Amino acid sequence: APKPLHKVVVCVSKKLSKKQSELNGIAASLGADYRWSFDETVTHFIYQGRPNDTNREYKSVKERGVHIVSEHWLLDCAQECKHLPESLYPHTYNP
């Protein structure tokens, strides 16, 4: 049975550790997989920050070219039950 985030693999940044289990579960309810820390399987890295952010984990993921999205990407995908465009939710996104 189709779910909107099938084949997505989320990883919540260390910065967002207090929200990590909750966000993993929100992603999983939409059919995504999740990793507890970053690796080569991750498709979507959840992160909140600033222009030219110096966070080490963020910079390492950015080098790998995977999607880096605000937590609001996941929250809005959940509200809509849809795979929403990642480009609308950069790490600097603020509602």
CATH number for position 82: 3.40.50.10190
* Domain span at 85: 1-95
Phi–psi pair at 58, nearest 5 degrees: -55, -50
- At residue 58's C-alpha, the angle toward residues 47 and 12, to 5°, is 40
Is there a contact between 91 and 84 (Cβ–Cβ < 8 Å)?
no
Could you write out the three-class secondary structure of the chain? CCCCCCCCEEEECHHHHHHHHHHHHHHHHCCCEEECCCCCCCCEEECCCCCCCCCHHHHHHHHHCCEEECHHHHHHHHHHCCCCCHHHCCCCCCC
The total of structural domains in the chain comes to: 1
Which amino acid is present at 70? S
